[PDB]
Amino acid sequence: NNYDGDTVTFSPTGRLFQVEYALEAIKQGSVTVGLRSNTHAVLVALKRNADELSSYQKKIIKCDEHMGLSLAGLAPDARVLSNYLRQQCNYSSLVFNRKLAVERAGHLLCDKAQKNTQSYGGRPYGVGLLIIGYDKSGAHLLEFQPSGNVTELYGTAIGARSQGAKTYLERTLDTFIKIDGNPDELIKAGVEAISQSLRDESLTVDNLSIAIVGKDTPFTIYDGEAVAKYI
Amino acid sequence: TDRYSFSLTTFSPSGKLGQIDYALTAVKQGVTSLGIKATNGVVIATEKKSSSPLAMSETLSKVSLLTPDIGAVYSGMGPDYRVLVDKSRKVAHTSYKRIYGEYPPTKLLVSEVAKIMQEATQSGGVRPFGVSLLIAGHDEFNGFSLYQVDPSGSYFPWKATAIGKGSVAAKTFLEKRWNDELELEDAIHIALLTLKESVEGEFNGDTIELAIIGDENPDLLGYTGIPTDKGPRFRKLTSQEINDRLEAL
Amino acid sequence: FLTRSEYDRGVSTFSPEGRLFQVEYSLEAIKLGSTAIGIATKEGVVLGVEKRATSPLLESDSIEKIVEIDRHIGCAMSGLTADARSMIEHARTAAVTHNLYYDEDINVESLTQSVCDLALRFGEGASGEERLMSRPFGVALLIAGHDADDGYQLFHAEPSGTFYRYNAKAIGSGSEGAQAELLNEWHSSLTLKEAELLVLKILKQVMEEKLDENNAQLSCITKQDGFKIYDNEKTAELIKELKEKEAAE
Amino acid sequence: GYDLSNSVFSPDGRNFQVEYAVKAVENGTTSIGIKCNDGVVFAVEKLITSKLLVPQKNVKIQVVDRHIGCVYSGLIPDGRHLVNRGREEAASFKKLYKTPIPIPAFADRLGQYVQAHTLYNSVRPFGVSTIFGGVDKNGAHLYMLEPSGSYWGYKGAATGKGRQSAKAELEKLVDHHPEGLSAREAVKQAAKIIYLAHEDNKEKDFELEISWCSLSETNGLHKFVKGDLLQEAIDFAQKEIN
Amino acid sequence: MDIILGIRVQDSVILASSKAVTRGISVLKDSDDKTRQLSPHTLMSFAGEAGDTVQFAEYIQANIQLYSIREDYELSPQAVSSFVRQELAKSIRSRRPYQVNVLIGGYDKKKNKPELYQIDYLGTKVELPYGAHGYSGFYTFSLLDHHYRPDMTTEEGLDLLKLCVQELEKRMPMDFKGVIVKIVDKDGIRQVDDF
Amino acid sequence: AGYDRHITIFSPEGRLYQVEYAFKATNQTNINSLAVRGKDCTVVISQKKVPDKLLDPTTVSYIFCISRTIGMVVNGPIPDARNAALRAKAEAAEFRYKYGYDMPCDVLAKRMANLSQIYTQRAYMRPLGVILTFVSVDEELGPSIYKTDPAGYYVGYKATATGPKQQEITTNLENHFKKSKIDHINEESWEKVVEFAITHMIDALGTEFSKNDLEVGVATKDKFFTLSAENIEERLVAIAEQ
Amino acid sequence: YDRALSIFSPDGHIFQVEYALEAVKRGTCAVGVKGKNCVVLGCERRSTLKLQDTRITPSKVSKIDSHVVLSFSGLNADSRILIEKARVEAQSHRLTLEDPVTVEYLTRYVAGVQQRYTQSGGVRPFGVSTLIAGFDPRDDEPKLYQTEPSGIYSSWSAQTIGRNSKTVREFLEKNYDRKEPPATVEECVKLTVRSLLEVVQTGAKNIEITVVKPDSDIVALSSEEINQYVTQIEQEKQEQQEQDKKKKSNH
Amino acid sequence: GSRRYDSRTTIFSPEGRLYQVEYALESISHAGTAIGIMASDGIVLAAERKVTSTLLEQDTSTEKLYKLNDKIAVAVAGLTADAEILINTARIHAQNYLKTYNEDIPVEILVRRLSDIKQGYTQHGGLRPFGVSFIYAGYDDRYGYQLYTSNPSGNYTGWKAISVGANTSAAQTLLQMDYKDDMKVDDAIELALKTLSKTTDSSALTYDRLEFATIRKGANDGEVYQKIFKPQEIKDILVKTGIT
């Protein structure tokens, strides 16, 4: 509490420090990797057990049958935004007879982050979401920050060891863009992505949780022994 | 967001309310004013002072009309005087002029304005009005009456009293010059003499604002042929009639 | 005492660690709870709690930590029980709401997630909706129950708004010492009565009192017979059949 | 110590909060606005900060109504909120009067809303400079709006990190043409002055985006510059810097 | 409306209420009471509208007893009467109309005199030596005036009231199957099973 | 107590630290004003200075027209100038609505004073940082000046100036009415009072002017107008030929 | 207002809940003891100050219902708010569910009421602890509950709150057996009076006693009766102490 | 913000006590002295004004004595400014009760209603408590004459004889020494006057600085004469007790 205070402070460095702090929420979270092609999106998520009598913590939430989100960070924070994205999608289905597109939903979300930074007694949400979908304009992968920035990427990560996933994806980038209508290949290259983002916790067929979306396939979540064909 | 709903007013640890002490100190930074209650009237007097000498003070007033029997005059903060005079008028009309059709008693009006000062001490988001007001008026049952509402929200009746920075001197003076028989004429020559000890600048009837809650005037009513509607007992005296009283000491 | 921090005038504020500070503080209040051990089998879930007493005057058979939420969902509460009084009431309302709407059982996970939604509501006035708590709760639950579509479940609900499915979980003061042993002794070959006795055996090690039936309490959830709280005499019987097996090692 | 709240005053006339908000905008990226005779040309620098990014699929230039471009720098989410408000305020005008909001009338709505957040302790001041203008029927206009809730007319305006350089090149261009230049011809000059304004900041690599509202080529609606025109403009600037 | 009569005896108020209850065109019940003891020494009987009567009658017992337990002393019948008046008064102005006609009878042990009151549905309090509402009232008001005396013993008040019952039965087209009798006196609030 | 200078509340001394700072934020821009009474007219000039070439000069103003016969000339910052401008326009319209004739100067002065008063008495309220001068020609009171200020106090005048160097201007007006022995300039042409005013402003500030360093407003009866830059230059050509 | 007045403390408490428990400790002492055919609440009447009329000063045991009495210790302002809220419930129960309250439902209500002012902000916690006693309707289980300002209720077979309460609790482990309560009103009363004569002292002045017998029998005992019991306890105690003393001498 | 500037004023200290109540009680001990003495025929409430001058009017002053209702008057000691809201709330409550039950208010009800108002301010809102201490004189059927004093917490206790404001402990001892259980209004007046003569900062106690009112069973069989005395009737009983 000097310049480092609540959501109202500047701060002679143009910052607000509430934003950097909520971005350590993400860092303290488990790793997740997204990657897309022009015909398929794939999210490959690392769940995290608390103990061996505890289960693994769901990391991927279905928003729609062509739209999905997967969180990284604080689970209570995620649940206020996840309810929100599904709510405006069903709203767009009702009113406009239309799927709520991924790019537009990034803009809606953006302003929802902004006003709890605007108002005193607010706080930024300490969750960053990766949001995939397939619409009438094709595949999109958005990376959402506690900042409120929405950005469009071919493949990204957030978590711990997020740097190691992006370096694998910088080499192999032009390979997965020209693989199209073969979802299998994209899934495996993302397994391979999250291999460089292990804390020696292993690749395991109940640690890794997949969800895909196609042109030709709904949103589907693979878990348990639906992941064994890659692993 | 907003949550000022908690008072900026608290009790100091040695007893009292801290802010009303600070506010009384601010009343000794203002102008000087006095009021004398005679047998046959009330006279009120104050000094006209202005920021720049090229300022027009004749188009400006520091004795204001609340109702046609009841006038006020201040010593203390200007901005705070101006707003509280308009509410005095708004509560006198809504709470006795719709409910009984006629202008309030002076005692009833003093309590109406003392609730406004109380609710500026109480409640969050506020501080007291930093003024001492004289509320002089006439009512039909306790005769002529003069009150002083202090920044606290108490009032006290007096027979003559003074306020502002020259208050100690002025009151010592009024202690011998008041009497159980007094004429309104004699009270006018008195009030000028005292307030002359309190003025250190120019001295003229253009600078001394005199109003009397004397006796009715049928000419300031604007109409005739009703004996039932009486004239205002207040009468602000134009500057020329005041310039005469300078010699009539 | 008086921890070195920068916030104690906010409640939804960060934190150079990057985690809510109040939430953090809450999990270090579950260790002032009394020890509740809970073993999940595939044949029932057993919830045992040390009731805790503090005088022998204290009548302790009219106090319990076991609360029936509905016929097929049990809960045992540990931590600060004034907070949990409000939490339990909320779930009971939801459970009945689902049976009104659909004339069907509520999922064990679906209910547990709902009381997590309640716990996220601390705040001065944030987000779109009103905040009707100022401060997060300091109580954690072992919601046992049985649903038709995943069988027997045991969940741990945190005052964080986060939930993990456990197959045995301990909460309270003696939580750490219990759970070490849970990691070691549990297998998926337990039955209803072997699990039952396994609760009183580890509950004896984290017993700071004396193991008897007036300070230890059992409860089961069985599919076709519902949630049934073991009477006190039957709990006495099990304590004795423990002593046969404790002089048989 | 006068940073407690945004309603406080300092004895040097300062209001520490608000001045610190300018530090936030200086970390932006170069953004220009060209007041031409026929209309306006906005351009924004879009950094490619990674090769994993999908180029020309993110906009930082969004229209408000159909004839007011708004291009912002500073805090990108915060500007998306200030742009979002002015679509509500703009549409209210059109309903109530059946005419699209005039550019000087729009200037007032936005200005007033930013000024408001320094009169209450309930909210935080916005840390953006927004640059907006377009063509109305009383002609083309340009405004630069401060995070202080202050604005003035401009014959050219700029913001960013390369703002010393931009504002400077823009004096040269108003000294080439005292009678001003075509918005047709301005497509190629926005390209030029963002490029010299990136020599300070040449650590990174960028994609040029340009937009215009002109009466002469886009019939007063604010459309994007695209196609062959866009890539010729890029080529123009490159030959100039070499 | 049905039977509901008061007579102010020297030392007591004798109230009586109809047994018969007809909602629809079939008598459904015929031993029901229409009276609820407010306080140890004030009884209130009611008739008026169906279903309005049962709810609003429970409402007054609740509130007057709320105040009784606050002050560990009981309100005078004059004071309870005024409360019932107050409420119904607000209710003819208010959105939903109540329509409850009440005889409040009590023995005040502090004025040492039995008190009888008639509160109509409009909201008019009146002290009376005998009273009645509705249909029954039209035949009895004149019948009680005839034979009365200022001071009459308790068992004389019963005999008179049974002349009024007996008369009613002949003349009314409605059937009421006899009354229930209650005495409110200085020695408490009792019933007489003799009809 | 400990806070009396970041919230509005009396000091130990009985003064308001917060409000004083508002009066110490009025000399930032460094605009000066001069206003004089004709016999049938009111004249006010204000400075217009732009620091760089790339501001368009037309939009840079300080003379803002509230009512049809009342002009309002603002000394202090341009964000709080716009909030004050807006507010008065709302009240002025409101007045016309409920009494049936367009708002007197006197009452418009009294109204903005009561709004200033509230901002120095509410905890979470930022005082206005402006002195407003209202110039009018009334039909009942004639040419008048009332000046409002952050305190919430107003005062009338023969003539007044504001700015950092205002003392020099006090001297010129004091001399002017020391010689005449009347309380206003006696001129029948609204133009030469604009001329007299400028002459005293050149004398007083010790500095030469141009059309663009001036900004001139005149209230005659039943209209308020501002002079354009062309019409301003002419007054300086008729000043030399006096 | 809506600002937090309770902020969770990192030592596993809330600061203001612990301050509230202290506000009862500096409060006046109540002793409550349940028999097997009565409940008895004895409460101290502070009468240190002279010239006080006790007839117009209320008692520190207040009957909520006609068969449920409540005594209290702690702050005497705040206590009156909990008691007005609890009388309102007592009637409500009759209105919507009929029958008078059971001891348990009310006890839970007072507990949730003090609980609301922690968890909510802008409302600070109370500092009052109650002994809630009575019999349920048509039963004769004497039920003695205690509520505390943390928002927790406990049943107890005998309980004490207020100043030097711990010293009284020590007495009750040895002089009241759980398995055998006293079996007469008169014995149970002489037991609680003896407890009051130790931490309040100064004759029968300060001693107030409410005795409840099943089925709506609440009576509060006259000064004269109290005067008889107190003087008997002192003489009986003098007679006993002295003969034990003698037997010690020789042995 | 707001959170920043908040002190917290309704919270506890480790004492389990509220500063703003003690601080209020302190400020009543700087004001004028107020005494009530209950006779078997009446109640005398006698109050000393903390200000006086030979230019103070006495003839429109009822700045400590105020009628709440025609059977209930109070003597006021504390912040006079605060008290005025509470007085008019008290008059309105009296009237509410009187409206709905058509019968004169008990003294018990009216003292408790005020105590709860004061209670509301310490309980919540972050407000300061009104700093007033009341002595209520009342007659009601049930208990006859009744005397009650209440303090800023919101707590009341009945009394036989009491003193509040400045010299609380001193005047009280005097009252213990000369109190007869039964008195006449004349014995109550005699005691009351002499105590305030023994506690005043001026060299002699004068009529021009005394407010004095009674409620007298000077009228009989369910009728009471309420009196607010004029200062010239106060002058006259001051020579009877021989002060003057």
Phi, psi at H176, each rounded to 5°: -65, -30
Nearest to H55 among B3, B154, B174 (CB): B174
Nearest CA to A195 out of A221, A155, A231 is that of A231
Could you write out the DSSP letters of every residue in G88-157? HHHHHHHHHT-SPPPHHHHHHHHHHHHHHHHHSSSB----EEEEEEEE-TT---EEEEEE-TTS-EEE-S
H1 min Cα distance to partner chain A (Å): 7
* Structural domain for H215, as ranges: 1-244
Cβ contact G–H (≥3 pairs, < 8 Å): yes
Q: State the chains in contact with E (3 or more Cβ–Cβ pairs under 8 Å).
A: G, H
Q: With an 8 Å Cβ cutoff, are D53 and A9 in contact?
A: no
Q: What is the rounded CA–CA span in Å between residue A170 and residue F57?
A: 52
Report the residue of chain C nearest H5, measured CA to CA: C9
The helix/strand/coil state of F103 is coil
CATH number for the domain harbouring residue H233: 3.60.20.10
- β-sheet bridge partners, residue G130: G72, G147
CB B118 within 8 A of CB H84: yes
CB F36 within 8 A of CB F170: no
Q: With an 8 Å Cβ cutoff, are H106 and E76 in contact?
A: no
Q: With an 8 Å Cβ cutoff, are F3 and H2 in contact?
A: no
DSSP E21: E
> In Å, how far from its chain's centre is CA E142?
19
CB G74 within 8 A of CB G21: no
- β-sheet bridge partners, residue C229: C219
Please indicate whether residue D49 is annotated as part of the active site. Answer: no
Nearest CA to D194 out of D226, D227, D169, D219 is that of D169
Q: State the chains in contact with G (3 or more Cβ–Cβ pairs under 8 Å).
A: B, C, E, H
Q: What is the rounded CA–CA span in Å between residue A7 and residue H135?
A: 51
Residues 6+ apart with CB under 8 A from F109: F134, F146, F147, F148, F154
Q: With an 8 Å Cβ cutoff, are F129 and D9 in contact?
A: yes
Report the residue of chain B nearest C126, measured CA to CA: B1
DSSP D38: S
Phi, psi at F208, each rounded to 5°: -40, 155
What's the half-sphere exposure (Cβ side, CA atoms, 13 Å) at G97? 10
The number of folded domains in chain H is 1
Interface of C with A (CB under 8 A): 6-7, 10, 12-20, 116-117, 119-120, 123-127, 160-162, 164-169, 179, 182-183, 186
* H38 token code pair: 């209950």
Q: How was this structure determined?
A: cryo-EM
- β-sheet bridge partners, residue H190: none
Report the residue of chain H nearest C9, measured CA to CA: H3
Cβ contact C–A (≥3 pairs, < 8 Å): yes
Mind listing the domains of chain D with CATH numbers?
6-242 (3.60.20.10)
CATH number for the domain harbouring residue B214: 3.60.20.10
Q: What is the rounded CA–CA span in Å between residue F67 and residue F104?
A: 10
Tell me the one-letter amino acid at D215.
L
Residues 6+ apart with CB under 8 A from E182: E14, E15, E16, E17, E35, E43, E45, E189, E190, E191, E192
- Resolution in Å, one decimal, please: 4.5
* B142 token code pair: 């306790």
> CA-based Rg of chain F, rounded to a whole angstrom?
18
Report the residue of chain F nearest H1, measured CA to CA: F124
Can you list the alpha helix ranges (DSSP code H) found in chain A?
A: 17-27, 75-95, 102-118, 162-171, 173-177, 183-191
Q: With an 8 Å Cβ cutoff, are A122 and C169 in contact?
A: no
* Structural domain for B221, as ranges: 1-249
Nearest to G19 among H16, H119, H143 (CB): H16
Could you write out the DSSP letters of every residue in E78-119? HHHHHHHHHHHHHHHHSSSPP-EEEEEEEEETTTTEEEEEEE
Q: What is the rounded CA–CA span in Å between residue B37 and residue B17?
A: 31
* F178 token code pair: 């020391």
Where do breaks (C to N over 2.5 Å) occur in chain H, by preceding residue number?
A: none
Q: What is the rounded CA–CA span in Å between residue G62 and residue G70?
A: 6
Could you write out the DSSP letters of every residue in H177-243? HH--SS--HHHHHHHHHHHHHSS-SSSS--GGGEEEEEEE-SS-SS--EEEEPPHHHHHHHHHHTT-
Say whether residue H124 is in contact with chain C using an 8 A CB cutoff.
Answer: no
Phi, psi at C177, each rounded to 5°: -75, -25
Nearest CA to A9 out of D123, D82, D26 is that of D123
Tokens 């002699």 appear where? Answer: H204
The three state secondary structure string of chain B is: CCCCCCCCCCECCCCCEHHHHHHHHHHCCCCCEEEEECCCCEEEEEECCCCCCCEECCCCCCEEEEECCEEEEEEECHHHHHHHHHHHHHHHHHCCCCCCCCCCCHHHHHHHHHHHHHHHHCCCCCCCCCEEEEEEEEECCCEEEEEEECCCCCEEEECEEEECCCHHHHHHHHHHHCCCCCCHHHHHHHHHHHHHCCCCCCCCCCCEEEEEECCCCCCCCCCCCCCCCCCCCEEECCHHHHHHHCCCC
DSSP C192: H
Could you write out the DSSP letters of every residue in A115-152? HHHHBTT----SEEEEEEEEETTEEEEEEE-SS--EEE
Question: Which residues of chain H make contact with E86, given a CB cutoff of 8 A?
Answer: 99-100
Q: What is the rounded CA–CA span in Å between residue D62 and residue D71?
A: 7
Q: What is the rounded CA–CA span in Å between residue G251 and residue H21?
A: 60
H3 min Cα distance to partner chain D (Å): 11
Q: State the chains in contact with D (3 or more Cβ–Cβ pairs under 8 Å).
A: A, B, F, H
Q: What is the rounded CA–CA span in Å between residue A128 and residue A143?
A: 8
Q: Cis before residue C15, ω within 30 degrees of 0?
A: yes
Q: What is the rounded CA–CA span in Å between residue F41 and residue G203?
A: 95
The number of folded domains in chain B is 1
Q: What is the rounded CA–CA span in Å between residue C155 and residue F91?
A: 63
H13 min Cα distance to partner chain C (Å): 16
E131 min Cα distance to partner chain H (Å): 22
Q: What is the rounded CA–CA span in Å between residue B151 and residue H226?
A: 33
Nearest CA to E7 out of E135, E131, E120 is that of E131
- β-sheet bridge partners, residue B44: B35, B211
Angle at B43 between CA B37 and CA B45, to 5 degrees: 120
DSSP F200: H
Say whether residue G90 is in contact with chain E using an 8 A CB cutoff.
Answer: yes
CB A10 within 8 A of CB A3: yes
- The Cβ of residue B227 has, within 10 Å, a number of other Cβ atoms equal to 7
- β-sheet bridge partners, residue A43: A34, A211
Q: What is the rounded CA–CA span in Å between residue B114 and residue B131?
A: 12
